[PDB]
Amino acid sequence: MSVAHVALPVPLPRTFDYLLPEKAGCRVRVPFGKQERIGIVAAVLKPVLDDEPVFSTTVWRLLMWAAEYYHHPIGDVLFHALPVMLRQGKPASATRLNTEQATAVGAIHSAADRFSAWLLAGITGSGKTEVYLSVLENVLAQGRQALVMVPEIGLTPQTIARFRQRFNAPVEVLHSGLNDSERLSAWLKAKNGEAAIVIGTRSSLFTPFKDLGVIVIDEEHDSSYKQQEGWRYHARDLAVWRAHSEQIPIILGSATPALETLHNVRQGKYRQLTLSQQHVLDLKGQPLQAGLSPALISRMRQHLQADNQVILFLNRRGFAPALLCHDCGWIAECPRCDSYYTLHQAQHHLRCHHCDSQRPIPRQCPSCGSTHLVPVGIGTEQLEQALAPLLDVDGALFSADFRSAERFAQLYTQVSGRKQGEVILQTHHPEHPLLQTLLYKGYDAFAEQALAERQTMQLPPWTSHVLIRAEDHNNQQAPLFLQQLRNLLQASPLADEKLWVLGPVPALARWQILLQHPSRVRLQHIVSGTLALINTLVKWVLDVDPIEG
Ligand SMILES: [Zn+2]
Ligand SMILES: [Zn+2]
Secondary structure: OOEEEEEOOOOOOOOEEEEOOOOOOOEEEEEEOOEEEEEEEEEOOOEOOOOOOOOOHHHHHHHHHHHHHOOOOHHHHHHHOOOHHHHOOOOOOOOOOOHHHHHHHHHHHOOOOOOEEEEEEEOOOOOHHHHHHHHHHHHHHOOOEEEEEOOHHHOOHHHHHHHHHHOOOOEEEOOOOOOHHHHHHHHHHHHOOOOOEEEEOHHHHHOOOOOEEEEEEEOOOOHHHEOOOOOOOEHHHHHHHHHHHHOOEEEEEEOOOOHHHHHHHHOOOOEEEEEOOEEEEEOOOOOOEOOEOHHHHHHHHHHHOOOOOOOOOOOOOOOOOEEEEOOOOOEOEEOOOOEEOEEEOOOOEEEOOOOOOEEOOOOOOOOOOOOOEEEEOOOOOOHHHHHOOOOOHHHHHOOOOOOHHHHHHHHHHHHOOOOOOOEEEEEOOOOOHHHHHHHHHOHHHHHHHHHHHHHHOOOOOOOEEEEEEEOOOOOOOHHHHHHHHHHHHHOOOOOOOOOEEEEEEEOOOOEEEEEEEOOHHHHHHHHHHHHHOOOOOOOOEEEEOOOOO
């Protein structure tokens, strides 16, 4: 007896069986209903494209783990990983260094014959790039390949040509401007060991290699590494996973490492290799124009009449604001959980998101009585409408998103080194502890303090998180769905009173629930069991280790 468990590109978390008349990871053409479909054999009844498995051993292992960790259909996951042409069932064929810099290269090179996750931490253009290129030389010397990941926007032809000139070997670049013939042919070149280096973005993570020797991720902290639609994987984590299974080094490069990364360094997980005028304006009691203080505008014009350009920064868009007093600096805090109230002016109430408390919007401040209470964290209201006739550190410090401070610290540290340049911050709380750490001690000091505060609040990366989203035209009832799913999560063996669930709370826009637990592995099992059984079902998607925004 022999029968093949085949995975199909469908949103259902299961394998379909078929018969074998006279291996796993090969593509097959199978009947599916009355039509025909391409599938991939997950393991070995109507009967049934490849000679050899289309995924390498370690890439196959990686995808199998990832599907189960992100709780996404094995079918999608596998077909998402393939070149478009292979999805459709077509054939698999196509007719200088200083002291610090040197030390880094050496350190990595001395452990290059096994797994080792290095954080290359250095201020902007201290030449982290130079380390990448030298480490790659040593790996390419040995005749092993390399994967270089950049953010989506980081594949500039300047960067590309600088690589191409450095290496007398073939470099294969997966930019978004390639067609399907080209993408496939490049995928083959990597698989066959013709391509010494592969440079791409997030999806370049799944490209196969004859002998992969090292992985480089530049701008490790960047958002583009987290896929926001469909299969919500994080390319950085999976790269580190892939490096672990293949037993090769990985280099994570950032001038402003994510706190996740720094935590991993403080613990044994990663090892750090390191490389070596502002005005703070108090908005309190000021007359503002378009949220701008006189002192800023005074400084703006003196830069505009000198014929220079002026950049203003705001807090993305659609994010729900907080409420504070423009005169006295009181902020709307939830009295039960010490957390900032999110303002819902459109529904005429104040709402907590860490717990779920309602409260009316007061038209006067309860701490000093001022009528001047303002919303903070708005720049989608066309600042140009107020600027043509003629920021928001608060938005980052008093957000309902617990990550906002970290995002700001990264921005500020980036733009602090981008003549004599002038940086101006506007805030209602110039003397905020965390802000002060950032401004006077630097990013890593901010991070160390921010990270200890995350432990206090039991937030990531001290805990793991899992979001579950629901969208229903009804606006109501869909939250009942999540309430059903909430209770189904309660009793599942593994509550340990540590599992902490936020009951259905409206998104920062759409409903969702949040799951929290110190153990990553325990929270994966809890989701695995409670998801196994479900019935009704209303949109609904599953986001492990979410970036929220
Ligand atoms: Zn609360
Ligand atoms: Zn007040």
